[PDB]
A paper describes a structure:
The first complete archaeal Ub modifier system, including E2 and E3 enzymes, was discovered in 2011 in Candidatus Caldiarchaeum subterraneum. C. subterraneum Ub (CsUb), E1, E2, and E3 are organized in a single operon, adjacent to a second E3 protein and a JAMM protease (CsRpn11) with high sequence similarity to eukaryotic Rpn119. We have shown that CsRpn11 is highly active on its own, cleaving both CsUb precursors and, at a later stage of the ubiquitination cascade, CsUb-conjugated substrate proteins. Our bioinformatic, structural, and biochemical results reveal unique features of the archaeal proteins, but also remarkable conceptual similarities with their eukaryotic counterparts.
Fitting to the thermophilic nature of C. subterraneum, CsUb is an extremely thermostable monomeric protein (Tm > 95 °C in circular dichroism heat-denaturation studies). The CsUb gene encodes for a precursor of 87 amino acids (Ub-pre). We could solve the structure via molecular replacement using human ubiquitin as a search model, revealing for CsUb the classical β-grasp fold with a two-residue insertion in the first-loop region. Likewise, a cluster analysis of Ub-like proteins reveals eukaryote-like Ub sequences in E2- and E3-containing archaea, while other prokaryotes only encode for more distant homologs. Again, the closest connections to eukaryotic ubiquitin are made by sequences from Asgard archaea and Caldiarchaeum (dark violet, magenta; enlarged inset), CsUb being up close with 31% sequence identity.
Author numbering: -1 to 78
Write the structure that this text describes.
Amino acid sequence: GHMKIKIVPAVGGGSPLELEVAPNATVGAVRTKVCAMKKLPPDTTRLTYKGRALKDTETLESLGVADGDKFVLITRTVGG
């Protein structure tokens, strides 16, 4: 099935994202999709969930995500 998740920037006025995501998708997949939308190199970004640093291969099932939950997107400089 799918759950609705929100992605909000840690800083600034960038738009939040709302994605419908499969529960067997992983954190890394979410980050790939967010970075595709944001036009960002993946390694310039991290996602946190309730403040926690995340392993890319967590599924959203294993992490205990629920419909409506939010991840925070932390970004860095992009010229490296």
